[PDB]
Each structure stands twice: as C-alpha cells, then as structure tokens.
Amino acid sequence: KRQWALEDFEIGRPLGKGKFGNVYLAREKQSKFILALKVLFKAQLEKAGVEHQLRREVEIQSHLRHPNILRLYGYFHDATRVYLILEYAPLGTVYRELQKLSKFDEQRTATYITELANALSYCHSKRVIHRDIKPENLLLGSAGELKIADFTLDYLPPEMIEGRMHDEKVDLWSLGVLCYEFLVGKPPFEANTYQETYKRISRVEFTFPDFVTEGARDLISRLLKHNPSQRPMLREVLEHPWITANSSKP
Ligand SMILES: COc1ccc(Nc2nccc(-c3ccc4c(c3)CCCC(=O)N4)n2)cc1
C-alpha cells in the first residue's frame, strides 16, 4: 500500500471516453508497468451522491483476486480528480466485440458464461453481489479471458426493479440476460422505453430466434425465472450440458 501520485505515471491512449471522466492507458515510470488509469471528477461524485459507493467498491475490489476479475491496484486523488489504478485488459470490452461480431457463437458464449460464473461464484463466497454485469463492464485479457470490471434496467432482475428484497440470485438473472445477449446480439427484455422494458422484465416476456439452440434455450429459461429460489446454483450452470459441450475453459 504505497500512496501514489499523478507524477508517478505517464498517461497514454484514451481507452474509453464517457460522461464519467475517462480511462487511459498509463505506464508507471519507475517500473515501466503498463496499466489503466480511470480519471473521475470529484465534484461529479459529490453531486451524484456516490462518494460512499466509490469508497466501499474500492475497498472490496482491492481485496478480490481472481483471474476473471479485473484487479484494482489502488487509487489516489488531487484537488479536482480521483484516479483508479486498474489492470489493463489488452483486448478491450466485450461490448465492442459484440458490436464487431453482432453476435457470438455457442463456444465463445459458453466459455464467457463459464468465466463469468467462476468469477461470480468466487464473488459470492466473499459476500459480494453485483448490479452492472453488462458488456461495457466485462473486459478481455491478453489471452482473451473475460474479466469483470465493476463500479439501464436491461440487466436487472424483477425483484430489484420492483423494489423487493434481493440476494445473490440477482447475479444468476444477469447471467441469463448476458447469455441471451451474447447469442442473439440484444438483451431479451430490450425495448424503446424504460417503462416498457420494466413491463417486459416484470412479466418475464422473452422469446428466442430460431437459431438459438435447445440447450441454450433451456439454460436461459432456467436462469430467467421470476422466483429467485427457482434459479439454479452457479455450480449447476457450470455443469449444464450445453455449457460443458460448448465451453473451452473448464
Ligand atoms: C478500444 O480498445 C480497448 C479499450 C479498452 C481496453 N482496456 C481497458 N482496460 C481497463 C479498463 C478499460 C475500460 C473501462 C471502462 C470503460 C471502457 C474501458 C470503455 C468502454 C466501456 C465503458 O463503458 N467503460 N479498458 C483495451 C482496448
């Protein structure tokens, strides 16, 4: 736990430009170690009321070490800005891949779902649940392995939007949503408005294009149950026949 400063880094290529600061390639001067630097504006964290949410996320994310979870090495701030020192994921976001390829084959999807489930299983056994398990938040390492990055309805389970009580089962719903989006190229409750999406999620109205195979339909259908208790354990996901037939990672 060495306290860092901007002068300890050479900043490079913008990796992502969003409304919330930006993420840059950076290199640590002394070590030459390449990483990614997320630049947040402190006045936009006060006035979005999330400074607590940041502090707690940073604390949790610094302790977590899994091959499919993007490492947070540390953080610092100056007058204006807060800096997150992150693992650099050379092959970029799953979002971008999905934009490129429009949709993923069964093998790539099943592999991604394995990697997710593994990283989630590990998460859960440290009492960490998640909300934004979505393509913008999944990155790809040098080996093309999935890495969960973490910090609009489309990925949220019924219990959450309805305002009901929720458990670790939210993340199972997310896998189903993502599994669907990976194969189809759009998430299963997508709409043109929030209000309608809300209805689609709440009534669990999804359908499958012809090309989605029977095994995939079965797994997605099992993951997208209204009743949390009826969604499978992560172990059952990893041991689904469609997953084991198609995945590449064990
Ligand atoms: C376009 O090619 C890339 C792009 C990113 C990378 N590596 C990388 N490594 C750590 C963080 C990030 C990161 C973090 C948050 C983020 C983004 C990116 C931008 C789009 C998604 C989004 O909404 N926000 N990217 C490598 C090649």
Residue numbers in the entry: 125 to 275, 292 to 390
Q: Could you pull the original sentences from the published paper?
A:
The Aurora kinases A, B and C are serine/threonine kinases involved in the regulation of the cell division process. Aurora A is involved in the transition from the G2 to the M phase of the cell cycle by promoting centrosome maturation and mitotic spindle development. Dysfunction or overexpression of Aurora kinases has been observed in various human tumors, such as breast, lung, ovarian, prostate and colon cancer. The resulting 7-(2-anilinopyrimidin-4-yl)-1-benzazepin-2-ones were synthesized and proved to be dual inhibitors of Aurora A kinase and VEGF receptor kinases.
To confirm the binding mode of the members of the new Aurora A inhibitor class, we determined the crystal structures of the kinase in complex with the representative inhibitors 2a and 2c. The two cocrystallized inhibitors shared similar binding modes, which were in agreement with the ones suggested by the docking analyses employing the constraint between the aniline NH and Ala213 of the protein. While the anilinopyrimidine elements of the inhibitors adopted flat configurations in the ATP adenine binding pocket, the benzazepine-2-one partial structures filled the hydrophobic region. Towards the hinge area, the pyrimidine ring formed a weak hydrogen bond from C(6)H to Glu211. Another hydrogen bond was detected between the carbonyl group of Ala213 and the NH group of the aniline element. The third contact was established between the pyrimidine nitrogen atom 1 and the NH group of Ala213. In the structure with 2c, an additional interaction between the methoxy group of the ligand and Arg137 was observed. The main result drawn from the docking studies and the crystal structure analyses was the finding that the 3- and 4-positions of the aniline ring are oriented towards the entrance of the ATP binding pocket. Therefore, these positions were assumed as suitable attachment points for further substituents that would not interfere unfavorably with binding.
